[PDB]
Amino acid sequence: YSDVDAILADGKQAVAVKHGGGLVVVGELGAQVLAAKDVSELPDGV
Amino acid sequence: DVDAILADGKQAVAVKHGGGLVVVGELGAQVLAAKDVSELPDGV
Amino acid sequence: DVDAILADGKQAVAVKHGGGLVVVGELGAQVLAAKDVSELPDGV
Amino acid sequence: RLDYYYKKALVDAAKEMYFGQLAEVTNMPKNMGKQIKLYHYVPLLDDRNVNDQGIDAAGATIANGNLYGSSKDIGTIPSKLPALTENGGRVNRVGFTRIQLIGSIKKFGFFYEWTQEAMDFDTDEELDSHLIQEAVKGANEITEDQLQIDLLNGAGVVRYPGAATSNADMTGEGTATVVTYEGLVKMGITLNDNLCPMQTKLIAGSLMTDTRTIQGARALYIGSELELQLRKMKDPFDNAAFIPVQQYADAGNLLKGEIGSIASFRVIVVPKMLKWAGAGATVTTNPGYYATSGKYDVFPMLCVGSGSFTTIGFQTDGKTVKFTTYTKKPGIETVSYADPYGEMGLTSIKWYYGSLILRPEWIALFKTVA
Amino acid sequence: TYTKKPGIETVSYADPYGEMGLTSIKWYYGSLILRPEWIALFKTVAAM
């Protein structure tokens, strides 16, 4: 990307990395993938 | 509600810029913690 | 130990609303930063 | 309402300190690194002295610059004596060696959190006081094991009961490898060569009826379990060996938490004494020994000198450690993007601990009893 | 005790740039037993 506006404009939210430095960018599937207790609740794409 | 997240044995990470709250799952985190193709669960 | 996490290369963030630390991996970050089924890494 | 709420709470007392008082500190500068080094010098005759400079008095190099070393054998010393002929061409060519001692400083800390709801709608309104009291007391406790773990690990004098040589050797199955009166005196004899000086002077004797006179001794720290074995311990003359503390209380001064004395040791009981739990032999038919966690449990017997514990304090002002606390009370103090309401609190205790164990002649003898 | 410090004191044809040092201790021991009957010795095998 180019700026912190681009990720927000893209819709993807951005979380601040405290230990390591940087800005991890989170998308809808990435969050939807991430929020999963077990194999059952993963996107149809995985 | 946020309490329902913890009751599900689920932790949650705040977002500084534009998310507010992102819920983080133990399968997801274990997926999220991965260098290469080697360290992802059998489900993936 | 946290240094082992950093020395390995994996970053880490802070879980505020309940929990400790989740550790971000290289593939996971790419996995996490995916909009649609054609934006996540090849392995998944 | 179904019951009456009594306000006063039952709070456990803090375990009394026994090891932190015997250590001396060495200040470590800030701007420089995290290690301290020493150059310990050894005697020329000591067998530790190894050096290339070793030319024989009447000859060439023999790779031994310590003459007869520490042989102490009359069949050896005359041969290795620095005999010199009339022609003084070459001689023993003694060498000297110094020992490098390295000490490290590590970091340790705490933290715990509480919500405003927990403090507000709780049955007891003194929750904050109880938490900080329990927190700081535990920090005092944890610091003690930091010291004790190192002291137990580092001890040149390690005598094993019977014919045992390692922790695994010890067992209670057959002839239980326990402390004998013979074993204790040898540890003092080994300690009598040097390092550990005589902690206390010998007791002359006071005018009484039952009082006995004891010799100069060195404090030996023991766990509570092994105390009984020391009590019922027959001397060579089938009499008692554990002189009770009361029999010399009138004459000499008393060290804190004393139970008695054996030979050249005054017994000190420490409530929090770490042990080698489940490190002996497999307990097939354990004959009623309290030492049983999967395998036999090995208990220590520690005798610290006065030159074997140099605790390094990073910025600690003449103390083994300082605790650095940080309280963020719920409210405006903890208002941020994470919680824009401030319904969270935080307290963290950080500290820096390190030890050296210079001149490692502390005595640590094991025992499997009870 | 004889001590030849590095410098001029050890300058020679072998080492014109005197750098080596030296320290030698010598003595004569001697021993005379006037009355051996006054010396008593007891041998013993020690325990353990």
Side-chain angles (χ1 to χ4, degrees), chain A, chain B, chain C residues 1-10 12-44, chain D residues 2-7 9-29 31-90 93-133 135-195 197-200 202-207 209-294 296-300 302-308 311-318 320-361 364-366 368 370, chain E:
Chain A
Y1 286 60
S2 93
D3 280 87
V4 73
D5 260 19
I7 39 185
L8 271 183
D10 228 19
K12 315 190 72 88
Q13 335 93 340
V15 192
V17 189
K18 198 42 71 165
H19 291 26
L23 251 68
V24 281
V25 54
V26 49
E28 58 296 34
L29 289 165
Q32 183 263 359
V33 163
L34 198 187
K37 322 248 335 202
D38 76 273
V39 49
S40 36
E41 48 280 65
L42 282 302
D44 40 338
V46 188
Chain B
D1 191 73
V2 61
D3 311 3
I5 301 311
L6 266 298
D8 204 6
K10 289 317 306 296
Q11 67 282 39
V13 153
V15 185
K16 204 202 251 193
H17 291 299
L21 270 148
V22 156
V23 57
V24 54
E26 79 306 24
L27 193 48
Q30 173 271 357
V31 163
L32 181 163
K35 289 260 205 222
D36 69 290
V37 52
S38 72
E39 325 94 299
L40 318 87
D42 36 356
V44 177
Chain C
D1 192 76
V2 52
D3 311 0
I5 289 315
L6 254 178
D8 192 13
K10 314 185 146 281
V13 303
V15 193
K16 268 314 171 194
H17 267 132
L21 263 65
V22 311
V23 50
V24 52
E26 301 56 20
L27 258 198
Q30 308 212 351
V31 154
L32 175 45
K35 265 180 140 156
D36 79 27
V37 85
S38 55
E39 198 192 297
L40 61 176
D42 51 9
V44 47
Chain D
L2 287 208
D3 49 12
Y4 157 70
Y5 177 102
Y6 190 32
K7 297 303 278 132
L10 268 198
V11 49
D12 207 284
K15 294 105 154 172
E16 53 284 18
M17 211 30 44
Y18 269 122
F19 278 119
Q21 40 265 81
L22 79 78
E24 56 303 352
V25 296
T26 46
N27 162 340
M28 163 85 87
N31 254 38
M32 94 75 78
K34 288 161 42 186
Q35 268 152 31
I36 169 169
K37 285 195 168 169
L38 301 193
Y39 294 179
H40 166 74
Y41 282 109
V42 295
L44 151 69
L45 277 178
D46 212 284
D47 258 318
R48 280 168 294 167
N49 202 244
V50 298
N51 48 54
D52 71 357
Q53 303 151 2
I55 197 135
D56 168 41
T61 321
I62 50 154
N64 195 87
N66 39 293
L67 276 292
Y68 47 79
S70 323
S71 300
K72 281 161 133 291
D73 175 54
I74 331 178
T76 312
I77 316 302
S79 69
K80 324 291 292 314
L81 273 186
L84 191 48
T85 76
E86 200 279 342
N87 35 286
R90 290 274 130 164
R93 245 277 290 268
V94 285
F96 313 99
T97 317
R98 43 183 209 187
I99 297 295
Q100 183 172 209
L101 311 166
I102 175 65
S104 74
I105 165 62
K106 328 284 304 300
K107 188 187 197 172
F108 313 94
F110 272 172
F111 95 93
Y112 60 96
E113 42 193 39
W114 66 99
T115 181
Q116 194 50 77
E117 315 146 11
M119 301 325 268
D120 291 344
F121 324 113
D122 198 275
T123 66
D124 178 59
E125 303 296 325
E126 292 55 62
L127 216 170
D128 54 11
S129 45
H130 291 315
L131 287 206
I132 204 67
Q133 281 169 63
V136 304
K137 161 270 297 177
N140 309 142
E141 286 174 5
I142 275 299
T143 293
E144 162 83 332
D145 320 60
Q146 310 262 131
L147 195 39
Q148 195 184 139
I149 286 162
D150 300 332
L151 301 153
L152 291 203
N153 283 324
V157 187
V158 285
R159 294 297 72 74
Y160 271 92
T165 49
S166 81
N167 269 7
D169 308 330
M170 291 256 254
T171 174
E173 292 278 288
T175 51
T177 56
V178 291
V179 169
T180 81
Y181 180 80
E182 280 64 52
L184 285 191
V185 306
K186 290 274 200 131
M187 164 182 348
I189 290 310
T190 310
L191 256 297
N192 275 321
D193 312 308
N194 242 318
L195 200 240
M198 261 6 219
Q199 292 223 347
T200 184
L202 82 161
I203 282 193
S206 159
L207 319 167
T209 323
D210 196 28
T211 43
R212 292 188 42 61
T213 64
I214 67 136
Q215 39 159 114
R218 338 196 184 174
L220 177 93
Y221 304 70
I222 186 49
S224 62
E225 307 79 350
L226 300 194
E227 181 285 355
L228 167 59
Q229 279 71 40
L230 328 183
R231 271 272 150 80
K232 43 162 292 304
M233 162 96 78
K234 303 250 179 191
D235 78 327
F237 308 111
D238 305 89
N239 320 310
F242 201 111
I243 178 57
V245 48
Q246 65 246 48
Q247 303 211 347
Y248 48 90
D250 181 21
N253 314 66
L254 281 159
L255 317 83
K256 155 164 148 82
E258 202 160 355
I259 305 311
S261 199
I262 278 73
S264 60
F265 291 112
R266 324 268 299 273
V267 157
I268 282 310
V269 66
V270 176
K272 186 92 170 273
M273 181 65 78
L274 292 322
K275 67 206 195 48
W276 276 274
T282 82
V283 281
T284 78
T285 310
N286 171 58
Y289 282 140
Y290 164 72
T292 323
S293 289
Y296 283 108
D297 311 356
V298 199
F299 312 98
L302 181 63
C303 173
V304 198
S306 295
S308 45
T311 54
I312 39 184
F314 180 45
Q315 288 323 115
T316 82
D317 294 7
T320 326
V321 84
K322 45 202 181 313
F323 297 108
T324 47
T325 181
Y326 285 117
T327 305
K328 274 192 235 152
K329 194 172 311 323
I332 293 329
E333 203 190 348
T334 60
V335 162
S336 197
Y337 89 71
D339 198 58
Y341 307 114
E343 306 290 298
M344 277 296 346
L346 203 46
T347 39
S348 196
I349 326 295
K350 315 291 195 207
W351 79 86
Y352 267 96
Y353 160 77
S355 68
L356 261 283
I357 300 197
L358 69 173
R359 207 173 258 101
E361 318 309 314
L365 166 137
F366 307 82
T368 47
Chain E
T1 298
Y2 295 122
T3 296
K4 284 185 239 167
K5 307 286 312 311
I8 311 304
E9 206 197 339
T10 49
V11 158
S12 81
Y13 81 108
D15 195 26
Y17 318 117
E19 223 80 66
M20 311 277 319
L22 207 33
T23 290
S24 199
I25 298 85
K26 320 275 199 55
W27 72 96
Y28 281 85
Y29 161 54
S31 68
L32 175 56
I33 313 309
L34 301 75
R35 311 172 149 276
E37 295 327 296
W38 293 13
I39 311 298
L41 183 75
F42 206 96
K43 326 241 189 152
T44 295
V45 174
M48 321 185 318

